[PDB]
Every structure is written in structure tokens, then in C-alpha cells.
Enzyme design. Structure first.
Site, PDB file in Angstrom:
ATOM      1  N   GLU A 728       0.731  -1.303  -0.040  1.00  0.00           N
ATOM      2  CA  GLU A 728      -0.077   0.148   0.025  1.00  0.00           C
ATOM      3  C   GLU A 728       0.896   1.234   0.112  1.00  0.00           C
ATOM      4  OE1 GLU A 728      -1.554  -2.955   1.852  1.00  0.00           O
ATOM      5  OE2 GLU A 728      -2.590  -3.083  -0.173  1.00  0.00           O
ATOM      6  N   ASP A 729       1.763   1.300  -1.091  1.00  0.00           N
ATOM      7  CA  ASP A 729       2.622   2.616  -1.214  1.00  0.00           C
ATOM      8  C   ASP A 729       3.513   2.859  -0.037  1.00  0.00           C
ATOM      9  OD1 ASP A 729       1.568   3.041  -3.781  1.00  0.00           O
ATOM     10  OD2 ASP A 729      -0.202   4.325  -2.932  1.00  0.00           O
ATOM     11  N   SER A 730       4.044   1.586   0.477  1.00  0.00           N
ATOM     12  CA  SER A 730       5.267   1.867   1.483  1.00  0.00           C
ATOM     13  C   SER A 730       6.423   1.298   1.035  1.00  0.00           C
ATOM     14  CB  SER A 730       4.599   1.038   2.618  1.00  0.00           C
ATOM     15  OG  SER A 730       5.454   1.168   3.690  1.00  0.00           O
ATOM     16  N   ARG A 900      -0.271   2.475 -11.220  1.00  0.00           N
ATOM     17  CA  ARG A 900       0.102   4.022 -11.537  1.00  0.00           C
ATOM     18  C   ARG A 900       0.702   4.167 -12.718  1.00  0.00           C
ATOM     19  NH1 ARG A 900       0.917   4.686  -5.688  1.00  0.00           N
ATOM     20  NH2 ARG A 900      -1.263   4.424  -5.042  1.00  0.00           N
TER      21      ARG A 900
END
Ligand SMILES: [Zn+2]
Ligand SMILES: [Zn+2]
Lengths: 1101, 66, 98, 43, 76
Positions: A728-730, A900
Site C-alpha cells: 500500500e505505497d510503502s 500507477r
């Protein structure tokens, strides 16, 4: 056939001779050189009520920057660093040479000091603009700062560019549907000091109604035309247009004004609306003044120009009819032919205009008082200069502007180099879903990616790489050259159709010629006149600020000539017969340095064009796309971007939201914001200890000096799902790298005070350590405070330690105003500075540094828009190592890539790997990258690694080789200033407000309606009671049984007491929220009488 | 600012190699051969030597009095 | 008649030209055919049956049109169906629209 | 419109009287029909 | 015109007074506490509903097939 290097030579020359911030400097230089005297001359003369006394204003001048150290000091000159350190204003004095007229004698001229104006940095006013690098180092200034900002009260304030609809031009549009109004035209006349909007409407009947601010109601078109000087309907009809089909729509308006035959009938018809109840002569006079000074003041306020204004009005009406007949579409509010950008020059000259008007008003008052009383005739003692000196400053410091617009001047953002550059090159739109949309006219003028997310999407933009804001020239010279070229005036044309018998169809086919939105005349053919004007400008005979366009719509043909300021214009190479004017010899001279970009534009090879002129331009991206039909060529195809959008490597491979987010979050990155950050005193400063220039660098990175003030570090990046703390975008960061100083940073906070003196007998807030005065914090808090009252440098400061010991006498016995370090913040005192302010008060500044080591929760972002917190810090042993032993510095989850669609990130990883291996430079400028991907992969294979940038990876924990290869790269990363260290807010039991009895300041988290409804949805009751009653404003109140009003318990006697009932009634205790009691008492302060009805707490039954 | 003592990825000393690498690259030699014969073969150290700014040279002019 | 696919109109008591232009505006804003409230109607295929998608909403007028069954008429708005079909039909339409 | 409010009053009074079991169903039905006939005749 | 044949219109019925009495006794409510339908609504006018009555409406629902709801007839 100019190759990439040839065009980049032109672009580099542009950025070399002309700085990054040139619009601000150009506007300020135009203000200083011309507008300063223009304001004085438009003021004209100082006339007083007494007839004999008069004042003539001769000339104005600005001295070198200086300050008044003493009451009558010699005004010693200062440096901008001294202004920053001592909280001074980097301003220069103004001497105005006004000659006094007493008893109608001129006398001898005298120049007097009228005030200090703040000057822009690196402009013509300050001396640091032309200083050498070594002198800049010696004085204490960073050699690389572009300037463009004022130093007001020690703070760097910059005037953001303000974008708004063009004034003095008429824009037509349809009226609202389902209304008596069918077509609307609005014109905004910008006078000297005031602005008036005139609205012209067409009702359901073909009558035309004209209105403006001071006059209530709608004035008929023919009535106001007759008031302006027109005598019969034929002149009005022929002034509106020359086409009978469009002339036939004025008849209902003319017969609505049929009763008005003479000019005086129109005048007193207007005067009835303007002011009612006075005599006819007074009505006529009032109508005369309002028409002269409140109708179209940009044309002129004198009665002589009135006739001219009438013609203008007719032209405006013409457009409405052209809109009604279907000949033209409504004007676009988004087209840059309709939008102008006001820089510091126009705003700051308006501010000087209003300040000088106030100064002259006060001077007239004082002079008339002195004359009627009898005093000294000298003007030196009646100057009252501060009326200007404070006023201008008060506009720059606060940012609230005279014209009603807000946020004109903002404190300069200095988180890093990129933030400062972007904030300097910023245009804010004053104003809809249509305005936020990206317009095709923005090509080459505004960055398509750089825009904030949210309510400001599309309203705040950045000036493009090769975008210039027009400075403007006088209209008179362009009018003269247009008339000399052969343009026949509109009044002359009408006269020679009326006075002499001529063919109306002969002049119907002619082309209208406009100048700055005003109908200037008629011409044989638009194309020939446009070509003549363009060639005259290119040859240098005409000014370069003149832009000419030819519409040639099948319905209507016009010529538009623009010379006003604020137009956003971009340079294009002129292409003639399919070959650009710039040639091989010019490029050789550029490379040798014989000629520059300015020499190219002067020679006529490259010309700046606006949107209106670009309307009829045909442009080619590349010389191989060039055809004989083409008119222009682009100097740099990738110059459509801004300062930040040119930071991205391979930005055309990313999705547009990714680039927009990168532009948004690249201003927050940590780095070296200035080389002189140690001597400078900033309230919030950041420092990256070991910043690295990007390995994958675009062409514009070296131009803006970013690689000399970098804001990040190259991180060995492995795109793999190593543990699951990168979901999650970490991201996962190597903790061993952090322990070696990978992204360690320092945060500087400044606490400053002034030993202010206030009226009294030698009353001052002396700085001294405190002994026994009121408000005393505690003897432990003053342990580290030195004898003089300020903490010594290089000491640990924890929690609420005091840094400067100050005692204050009461305003209405000493009190403690000493500085307490913020409770959360812990750090070491870095610097202590002591100065004397201009007014003579002691100023003390203490800068405290705090070391920030990256941790879990710290936010990091790449150059492509992949923001994310640190999921975990992993040791070198645990990280998956390769066959060569290289462990990742940052691990990123592959699942972040495909949704993305950021291919530029993988491309940058491969490019960084190739750059580190081969050592050769990598250029990733959009649309032109050197080398290409295939050659990079081949060279990577040659150096010893896999061509596809993957490599064999072994699991660090277990030692077992992974079943698949893992991509490795050196993607550039930046550390954002949203650290988790200062983002924690947690509250235990603490203080509450005196009024509401609710917890705030550490303050508590607001629960709110939505969380209340969540708790209701779970059905819990005691949890709601705990979260909304027990932990906040829990109170008990005694309520009388009979009347129900809130009573009180008396501590002396155990009996309860009712405010109304006295002692005879019984009172019961009820536990409620104190907010409800406050509401009851506030309703009781009204005439509302809430009577609380008690009931048994038990269910009874 | 000043070159790190050790490579961030692998704890290998690269500070002592800054002066020779910088002096020889500024002399007119391609960085690839200089890096290869200097003793840094892992590209993690190469990015340390290649992408350095040496801000400390400019800062010594603007130093806090303290 | 004047020219074919054209004609001309004169008046006796026309009075002022303002009245003439108001009369012209009245003439142009005159409906030739079709019931009120509908801007355009497009025939579309839903499978072995052709329906009409209408940009306007007039339940009573369309119900009065010959060739349309009153039993299956769908309206975007919920107020006119409530006025015509009652409150239970209005509730059903509200649920279906949501 | 007063007829509608008065009819509502009478109907709710009859319903409350029925809920107290003052009289059986059939008489209440006659009362409902009678009041509806009487005060719809006016409308 | 008849609107009861429309697809949107459920099945409206007027139930006798004994059934209404049993319903209000079982529900334990006053009759006005039920959701109420105006006597001028076309669906109520079609079946000749009078104020003070209770209308049984069967709707087509996907969960039970046919759902029975009760409405109260009010005055205007
Ligand atoms: Zn009482
Ligand atoms: Zn290494």
C-alpha cells in the site's frame, strides 16, 4: 536542420542572459525607470484651497539602499544580509524635487525625502545585482540566488503573479437561459486608481440597455450615446457599424430614445437616476461628472475625450449584434488573448499611486493649516514621509492589498532550491470547472503538470521554461505608426461616407483594425497590414512589444494589435520558405559566444509571440517536420514544462497524475536550500547532511543549479516484495545505510524577541535571568540560562527550557514573558545572535538544531510521484543480497507500478544503474534522451551486469537463492519534511477551556458528528457516554423541582439554593455535559426560558 | 556536503578515494577507467563517488561564528 | 407566398416598431408540432423492440399520444409520476432510480 | 379546507373510541361511512 | 384513464374494519402511526378509498416475492 545540441545552445543562451526569474525583475525595472515618474506626472500638481499657494512636482529619484541609524544620521548603506539579520527592510529612500509656489513665484527647486520603498533583490535598484562572485561571498550573499523578492521586516516576501481578465477590452457572451436578457457584453475600464465595470445587455426585444456602477437602473443605448455628443440617430447607426443588416437592429433602441432629441434631454434623464431631488442644473452637472469620470475613464476623464468614448461604446454594441446575428462565438474567458498577468510592477505602482495620493492629501491639509495659521514656508518640516514608508511596507508584510485582492505577497518558501524557484515563478488565477480545464493556449506558457490538487487545481500555475510576460509600451507610438501605415480613422470613414457620397459596400469589405481592444480604423486588407507590422517589428523599426493578428473569419475579418503589459508570450524561431532564419553561422557564433539570445531576437531571427498572434501561426516541433506552409519553429520542444516538470526523468512515460503529484511533493523535499544557511536566520529550516546530485539528470537540472544544491540521494532500489512492509505505497529502507548517514537531516527552529520600549519613565523589558517575579516557571527551567539572560550555544535543550530571560512591566510588578522552548521539541542550541533594531531595541535570536534520523513512518518520495512512509528498517544481513553482495537501500513493492503506470521509474532505475557502471552522463530530457534504452542495456551487459537490470538475488535470512531474478536500480529519492517525529498528537487528562470546560491545549482530538454516528451504528450506549460525556465537560448541576432553573449548592450551609425559589424548594443533582448547561444559560441570556423537567433515574414501573 | 566515510549500501570506505578520483577525472580522464583501477567495482560505491557535490568547499565561507 | 419555402407578413395596426419586434419574437417562439417539454426524441433498439429515449419529461402529454401504451412508461423524475401514478409508484420509482 | 381537518379529527376520535372497545366493529363502520358521506357531500 | 395497470403501481386493496382492528391490536399502535396515503391519490381514488381506512398494498419484492404493507387514508 538544427539538431538537438544546436537548439539547446539557444535555450542555454536564453537561460544564461535572462535569469530564471525575469518577469519580476522586468516589471520592477519598468516601474522604477518609468512608472515612478508616471505616477508623479499623472498627479500633475499640488493645488490648495488658498489660491496663491501652489506646489509643482518636478522629478523623483531613488538613492542606494540605506537605513537611518540615528535621528539625524547620514543614512549609511547596508547589505541584504544585514537586513535579514536585524529584521530590517531592504528599502531605498525617495527624493522628490518639488518647487514651492508662494504668491505665484516659482522660487528655487528643492528635493525632499518622501519615504523609503522596498526594492527587489537582484534588480537595478540594489547594488548586489552586478557584484562579482567573490564580492557576493565577502558581503555574505549566496552567489546563486536569483533574487526577485523583497526583504520586508527581515522576511523574504515575494509578490505572486496575479492572473485576471484583460481590462479595457469588451467580452461578449450569451445571457442566462430562461430570462429576458439574451446577450451580455462586459467591459472593465482600469483607470488611474479605480476600476469601473460597464455592462451592456440586449433584452428580449431588440432594445439595448447600458449600465454601470454608480447609475442605478439600465440606461438605453441611444440615450447614453446622445449624452456623449451624438446629435441624431444617423451618426449613432453609422458609428455602430456599416452593414445595413446589422444596423437594422438598433431601430427599437433609437425609438425608445426617440423622445430624447438633444444632448441635455439625455443628460438630465441620466441625472434623474444618478441623484434625485435636486434642481435641473444640479442634475445636469452631476450627470456630467459621473459620465466623464465613472463611465470609461481609461479613454479619458476630460470632457474633450467624451466624444471618443462614445465611439468606443458603439463598437462594443456592434459586437453584441455580431453575437446575436450568429457571426461570432462568445469570447473564451480561458483564452490567453483575454487574460493578463500582473507582476510586481503593475501592483507595486498602483500601491505607490495610492500611497502618494494619501501623502499629498495629508500634505495639503498640513499646508493649508499652516497657511491659515501662519508658520514656516519651508516644506522640509512638513514632509511627513512615513505616510509612504509605512504604507507600502504594511502592504508587503501583511499581504492584504489596496485593490481588495488578498495574498499578493507571500513569505518565500525555502524548503529547498526547487520550492523557492517554483514559488518565485507562480501565477495565481483570481477566479468554475471550465477555468480549471487545461487550455490548448497554455502550450509554451504554463506548465501542464504543475498544479495543486484540490480546490486550486488549474487555478495556480507555474510559468513555463520559455515564457515571458510582456512589459508594455505607450499606446501613442503604436497608434501613430498604424495611422502612418495607412489606417483610415473610423470618424474619417464615417465622414467620407456621409459628407461625401461614397459606396458603403466599398468600405464594408474593408478590414477593421483594432488597437488594444479599441476600434482604431479601417484598412484595405488585414493580411497585408499584419505582414507590414510584423516585418517592421522584426527589422527593429517598431517595438518588439507589439503583437499583430488577423482573424479573417468568413463572417468577419479584423486586425488586432496589442501592446499592453501582462501578455504571456513565448519565443519562436521564424521560419521563411520552409527554412528557419537561424542558420549554421548563428549557431557557431552562439557556441563561440559572439552573440546571445538577445542578439538573436534583435536580429529578427527569433520573435516572441502572444496567444493572439499565435492564433494565425503554424508551428513545427522539429526541423524535419518543417514545410513551406509552416511559419514558426520551437526553440525547445520540452520547454512546455516548468521548473519542476523538467526535474522528472523520462516524464512522457509516466501518467499525468504521477507528474502532477511529483511537482506537488518535490517542493517538500529536504536538501540544501542555500549555501549560506548557517548565517541566515529562518524560522523553519531543513538540512540534508549528505545530498547527492541525480545520476539520471535532465538538461535543465544543471541550468537551475539544482545539482549544486541537491535535495536527495541516489538509493539502490530493488523492485520486489521482500517482506510485506512495503505494501500500500510503502517502502523498506536499509537500516545499516541509515546508520551510515543515508538520509540523516537537521531541523532548525528560531526563537527571536525584541526588548521593546513602551511609553513611560525609562520603562524597558530588560533581558535578564529571573529571581522571584510573578509567573515564575521554576528554578529548574533556568539552569542553562547564562548570566546575560540568553542561553549559551551548544547546550542540550529539553522540553520547556527557557532560552531568553525577559521581564516585562505591566501595561495596566514584573511579569514573565520569557521564551519557553516548545514542549514536544527537543534539540541543541545552534546559534545565538544579538543586534540593535532601528528603533533602538535589543533583538535576540536563538536558533536550535534537532537531529532527525529516518525511522518507521517517515515519508519519502521519488522524482515520479511515488510517495510513501517507511514500513520498516531492515539490517544489511536481513536484506536480500546479490551475487556481488550489493544489498538494496530501498525496496519498493512491484504492485505499485502497474496501476500507477509509472514506466519512467523503471527507466530511471536502469539509467542510474548504467550511469553508475559506465560512469558516462545520462540525459533523460523528455522527447530526447541520450543514450537510448537499448544502448544503455547493451553497455550494462558489457560492464558485467544483466542487460535487463535484473540480477541474481539470494535471501539474506536463509541464504537460499530466489527462484527468480530481481530488478535493481539507483532511482533518486527525496526525504519529505512530513516526519512522524512532529506529527504525533496525544492527550491524557489535562487543561480545559475557561468557558466551555472542554479540553484543548496538548489538545484533544475532536470526536465529531461522523464518529458519533459510527458509535451509534454499532449500537453501543455506554461507549458513547464515555467518549462524549465522561471524558469531556462532565458536570453536575442542581435543578429546582418546581421552576426547573439551575440552582447551586452553598458550601457554608448544606441546604440547596434556587435562584428563583430561594431556600423553600428542593433541588436535585443531575449529571450532564457542561456544554448543555452553557447552552441553557445562553438561551436564558435570551428571552428563551428553558425549564428542565426532572425524572426518576430508576425505571420505576 | 562532505563525502561520506563509508558507502551507504556496503560499509566500504570511499572517503579516501574522493581526492584521487576527483583530481584524475578533473585532469581529463574518463571516470570509468579511473573508478575501475582505483578499486571500486560495485556500482553502489560508484554512485557514491560519481554523484557527489562537495558543498563543504562553499560552506566554509558561510560558517556560523559560534 | 413570396418565394417558395418562404413567405411574408404585413400588419395593419402594428403601431410602434417595438411592438413589431416583440411580435417577431412571439412569432419565432411559436411551437409547430409536438407536446411541450420535450427537446428531442431518439428511437433506440433494446432487442426485438424499439423504444424512444426522450430528453423531456411530460407524462400526461405522452400518455395522451396515440400509439403509446400507458402501462410501460419510464420517467426520470419522481414528482410527476407521484402526481399521476400515486405515492406507491413514486416510492418504487425512487428505489429503482437509486 | 376546514372540512378535511374536521373529518380527520372525527376519524381519529372514532378510532380511539374503537380501541377502547366502546362499541363493536359494525357500528363503527356505519359511523365511518356516515361521516364520509356527510362531509364529502359538502366537498 | 386507468393507472392501476401500470407496472410501477403495486396491488392496492381496501381491507375490512375487523381486519384493521386486528392489525392495530397486534401491532400495538394507533392507526395514525402507520405510514399514511392521501385520499386524493389516484391509486386510492381508483379503489374508492375513504379517509380513516387502512389500505393493504402488495408489492413485488425480490426477497419474499410479495410483500404486504399497510397505509392509512388521511384527508387531503
Ligand atoms: Zn425554583
Ligand atoms: Zn558500496
Amino acid at each position: 536542420m538544427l539538431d538537438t545540441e544546436s537548439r539547446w545552445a539557444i535555450a542555454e543562451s536564453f537561460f544564461k542572459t535572462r535569469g530564471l526569474v525575469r518577469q519580476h525583475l522586468d516589471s520592477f525595472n519598468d516601474f522604477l525607470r518609468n512608472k515612478l515618474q508616471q505616477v508623479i506626472y499623472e498627479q500633475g500638481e499640488i493645488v490648495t484651497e488658498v489660491p496663491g499657494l501652489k506646489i509643482k512636482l518636478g522629478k523623483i529619484r531613488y538613492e542606494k539602499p540605506s537605513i537611518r541609524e540615528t535621528d539625524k544620521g547620514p543614512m549609511r548603506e547596508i547589505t541584504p544580509m544585514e537586513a535579514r539579520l536585524r529584521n530590517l527592510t531592504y528599502s531605498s529612500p525617495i527624493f522628490l524635487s518639488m518647487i514651492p509656489v508662494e504668491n505665484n513665484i516659482e522660487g528655487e527647486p528643492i528635493e525632499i525625502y518622501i519615504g523609503d520603498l522596498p526594492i527587489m533583490l537582484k534588480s537595478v535598484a540594489d547594488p548586489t545585482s552586478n557584484l562579482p562572485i567573490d564580492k557576493l561571498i565577502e558581503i555574505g550573499e549566496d552567489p546563486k540566488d536569483p533574487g526577485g523578492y523583497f526583504i520586508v521586516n527581515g522576511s523574504e516576501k515575494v509578490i505572486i503573479a496575479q492572473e485576471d481578465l484583460a481590462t479595457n477590452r469588451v467580452l461578449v457572451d450569451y445571457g442566462k437561459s430562461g430570462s429576458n436578457i439574451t446577450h451580455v457584453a462586459k467591459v472593465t475600464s482600469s483607470a488611474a486608481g479605480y476600476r469601473v465595470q460597464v455592462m451592456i445587455e440586449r433584452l428580449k426585444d431588440s432594445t439595448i440597455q447600458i449600465s454601470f456602477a454608480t447609475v442605478p437602473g439600465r440606461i438605453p443605448f441611444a440615450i447614453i450615446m446622445r449624452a456623449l455628443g451624438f446629435v441624431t440617430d444617423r451618426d449613432i447607426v453609422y458609428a455602430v457599424s456599416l452593414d445595413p443588416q446589422i444596423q437594422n437592429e438598433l431601430l427599437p433602441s433609437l425609438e425608445q430614445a426617440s423622445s430624447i432629441t438633444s444632448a441635455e434631454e439625455a443628460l438630465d434623464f441620466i441625472g434623474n437616476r444618478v441623484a434625485i431631488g435636486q434642481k435641473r442644473e444640479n442634475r445636469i452637472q452631476k450627470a456630467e461628472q459621473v459620465i466623464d469620470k465613472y463611465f470609461l475613464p481609461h479613454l479619458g476623464t476630460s470632457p474633450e475625450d467624451r466624444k471618443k468614448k462614445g465611439y468606443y461604446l458603439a463598437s462594443a454594441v456592434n459586437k453584441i449584434l455580431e453575437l446575436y446575428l450568429g457571426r461570432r462565438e462568445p469570447d473564451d474567458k480561458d483564452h490567453y488573448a483575454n487574460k493578463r498577468v500582473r507582476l510586481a510592477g503593475d501592483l507595486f505602482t498602483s500601491l505607490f499611486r495610492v500611497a502618494f495620493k494619501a501623502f499629498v492629501k495629508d500634505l495639503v491639509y498640513q499646508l493649508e493649516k499652516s497657511k491659515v495659521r501662519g508658520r514656516r514656508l519651508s516644506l522640509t518640516a512638513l514632509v511627513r514621509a512615513d505616510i509612504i514608508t509605512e504604507r507600502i511596507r504594511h502592504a508587503l508584510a501583511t499581504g492584504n492589498w489596496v485593490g481588495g485582492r488578498t495574498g499578493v505577497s507571500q513569505l518565500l518558501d525555502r524548503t529547498n532550491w526547487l520550492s523557492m524557484l517554483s514559488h518565485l515563478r507562480r501565477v495565481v488565477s483570481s477566479l468554475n470547472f471550465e477555468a480549471r480545464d487545461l487550455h490548448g493556449t497554455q502550450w509554451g506558457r504554463m506548465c501542464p503538470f504543475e498544479t495543486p490538487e484540490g480546490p486550486n487545481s488549474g487555478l495556480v500555475k507555474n510559468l513555463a521554461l520559455l515564457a515571458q510576460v510582456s512589459v508594455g509600451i505607450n499606446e501613442s507610438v503604436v497608434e501613430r505608426v498604424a495611422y502612418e501605415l495607412g489606417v483610415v480613422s473610423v470618424e474619417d470613414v464615417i465622414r467620407r461616407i456621409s459628407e461625401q457620397n461614397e459606396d458603403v459596400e466599398k468600405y464594408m469589405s474593408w478590414s477593421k483594425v483594432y488597437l488594444n481592444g479599441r476600434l482604431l480604423g479601417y484598412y484595405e486588407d488585414g493580411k497585408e497590414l499584419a505582414k507590414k507590422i510584423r516585418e517592421s517589428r522584426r527589422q527593429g523599426k517598431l517595438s518588439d512589444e507589439v503583437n499583430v493578428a488577423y482573424i479573417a473569419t468568413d463572417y468577419l475579418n479584423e486586425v488586432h494589435i496589442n501592446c499592453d503589459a501582462g501578455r504571456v508570450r513565448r519565443p519562436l524561431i521564424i521560419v521563411n520558405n520552409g527554412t528557419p532564419l537561424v542558420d549554421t553561422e548563428d549557431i557557431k557564433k552562439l557556441k563561440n559566444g559572439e552573440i546571445t539570445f538577445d542578439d538573436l531576437v534583435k536580429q529578427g531571427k527569433i520573435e516572441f509571440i502572444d496567444a493572439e498572434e499565435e492564433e494565425n501561426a503554424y508551428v513545427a516541433l522539429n526541423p524535419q517536420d518543417l514545410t513551406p506552409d509552416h511559419t514558426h519553429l520551437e526553440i525547445w520542444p520540452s520547454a512546455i514544462l516548468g521548473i519542476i516538470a523538467s526535474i522528472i526523468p523520462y516524464p512522457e512515460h509516466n501518467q499525468s497524475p504521477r507528474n502532477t503529484y511529483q511537482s506537488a511533493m518535490a517542493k517538500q523535499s529536504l536538501g540544501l536550500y542555500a549555501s549560506n544557511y548557517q548565517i541566515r536566520t529562518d524560522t523553519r529550516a531543513h538540512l540534508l547532511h549528505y545530498p547527492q546530485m541525480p545520476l539520471v539528470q535532465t538538461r535543465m537540472l544543471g541550468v537551475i543549479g539544482y545539482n549544486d544544491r541537491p535535495a536527495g540521494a541516489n538509493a539502490i532500489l530493488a523492485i520486489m516484495s521482500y517482506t510485506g512492509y512495503n505494501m500500500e505505497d510503502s517502502i523498506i529502507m536499509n537500516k545499516s545505510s541509515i546508520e551510515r548517514g543515508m538520509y540523516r537531516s537537521t531541523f532548525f527552529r528560531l526563537y527571536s524577541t525584541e526588548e521593546v520600549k513602551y511609553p513611560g519613565g525609562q520603562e524597558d523589558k530588560i533581558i535578564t535571568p529571573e529571581a522571584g517575579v510573578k509567573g515564575y516557571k521554576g528554578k529548574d527551567y533556568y539552569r542553562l540560562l547564562e548570566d546575560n539572560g540568553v542561553v549559551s550555544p551548544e547546550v542540550e535543550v529539553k522540553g520547556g527550557d527557557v532560552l531568553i530571560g525577559k521581564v516585562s512591566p505591566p501595561r495596566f510588578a514584573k511579569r514573565d514573558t520569557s521564551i519557553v522552548t516548545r514542549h514536544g521539541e527537543n534539540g541543541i542550541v545552534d546559534l545565538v545572535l544579538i543586534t540593535e533594531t532601528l528603533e533602538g531595541n535589543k533583538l535576540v535570536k536563538v536558533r536550535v538544531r534537532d537531529l532527525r534520523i529516518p525511522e518507521i513512518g517517515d515519508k519519502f518520495a521519488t522524482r515520479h510521484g511515488q510517495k510513501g512512509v517507511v514500513g520498516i528498517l531492515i539490517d544489511q544481513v536481513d536484506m536480500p543480497y546479490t551475487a556481488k553482495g550489493i544489498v538494496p537501500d530501498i525496496i519498493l513493492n512491484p504492485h505499485a507500478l502497474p496501476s500507477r503506470m509509472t514506466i519512467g521509474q523503471i527507466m530511471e532505475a536502469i539509467g542510474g544503474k548504467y550511469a553508475a557502471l559506465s560512469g558516462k552522463p545520462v540525459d533523460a530530457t523528455p522527447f530526447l534522451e541520450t543514450p537510448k534504452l537499448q544502448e544503455m542495456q547493451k553497455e550494462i551487459l558489457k560492464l558485467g551486469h544483466l542487460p535487463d537490470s535484473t540480477e541474481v538475488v539470494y535471501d539474506g535470512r536463509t541464504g537460499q537463492k530466489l527462484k527468480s531474478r530481481i530488478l535493481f536500480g539507483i532511482v533518486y529519492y527525496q526525504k519529505l519534511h512530513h516526519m512522524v517525529a512532529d506529527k504525533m498528537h496525544a492527550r491524557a487528562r489535562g487543561p480545559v477551556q475557561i468557558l466551555t470546560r472542554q479540553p484543548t491545549e496538548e489538545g484533544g482530538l475532536r470526536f465529531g458528528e461522523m464518529e458519533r454516528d459510527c458509535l451509534i451504528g454499532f449500537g453501543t450506549a455506554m461507549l458513547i457516554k464515555d467518549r462524549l460525556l465522561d471524558n469531556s465537560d462532565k458536570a453536575v448541576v442542581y435543578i429546582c423541582d418546581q421552576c426547573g432553573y439551575v440552582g447551586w449548592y452553598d458550601r457554608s450551609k448544606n441546604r440547596y439554593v434556587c435562584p428563583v425559589h430561594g431556600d423553600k424548594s428542593v433541588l436535585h443533582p443531575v449529571t450532564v455535559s457542561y456544554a448543555f448547561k452553557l447552552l441553557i444559560q445562553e438561551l436564558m441570556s435570551m428571552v428563551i426560558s428553558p425549564r428542565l423537567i426532572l425524572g426518576e433515574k430508576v425505571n420505576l414501573g | 556536503m562532505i563525502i561520506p566515510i563509508r558507502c551507504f549500501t556496503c560499509g566500504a570506505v570511499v572517503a579516501d578515494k574522493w581526492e584521487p578520483f576527483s583530481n584524475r577525472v578533473m585532469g581529463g580522464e574518463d571516470p570509468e577507467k579511473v573508478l575501475t583501477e582505483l578499486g571500486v567495482n560495485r556500482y553502489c560505491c560508484r554512485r557514491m563517488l560519481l554523484s557527489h557535490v562537495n558543498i563543504i568547499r562553499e560552506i566554509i565561507h558561510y560558517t556560523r561564528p559560534i | 407566398d413570396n418565394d417558395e419555402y418562404s413567405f411574408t407578413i404585413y400588419f395593419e395596426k402594428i403601431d410602434s416598431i417595438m411592438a413589431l419586434f416583440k411580435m417577431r419574437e412571439k412569432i419565432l417562439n411559436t411551437k409547430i408540432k409536438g407536446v411541450k417539454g420535450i427537446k428531442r426524441a431518439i428511437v433506440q433498439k433494446k432487442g426485438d423492440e424499439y423504444v424512444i429515449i426522450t430528453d423531456g419529461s411530460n407524462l400526461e402529454g405522452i400518455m395522451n399520444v396515440t400509439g403509446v401504451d400507458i402501462n410501460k412508461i419510464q420517467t426520470n423524475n419522481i414528482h410527476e409520476v407521484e402526481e399521476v401514478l400515486g405515492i406507491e409508484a413514486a416510492r418504487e420509482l425512487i428505489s429503482r432510480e437509486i | 379546507t376546514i372540512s378535511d381537518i374536521e373529518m380527520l379529527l372525527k376519524d381519529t376520535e372514532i378510532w380511539d373510541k374503537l380501541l377502547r372497545n366502546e362499541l363493536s366493529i359494525e357500528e363503527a363502520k356505519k359511523m365511518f361511512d356516515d361521516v364520509a358521506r356527510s362531509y364529502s357531500k359538502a366537498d | 384513464i386507468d393507472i392501476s395497470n401500470h407496472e410501477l403501481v403495486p396491488k392496492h386493496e381496501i381491507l375490512q374494519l375487523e381486519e384493521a382492528y386486528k392489525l392495530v391490536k397486534e401491532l400495538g399502535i394507533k392507526p395514525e402511526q402507520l405510514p399514511w396515503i392521501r385520499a386524493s391519490d389516484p391509486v386510492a381514488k381508483s379503489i374508492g378509498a375513504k379517509p380513516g381506512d387502512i389500505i393493504k398494498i402488495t408489492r413485488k419484492s425480490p426477497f419474499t416475492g410479495e410483500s404486504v404493507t399497510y397505509r392509512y387514508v388521511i384527508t387531503g
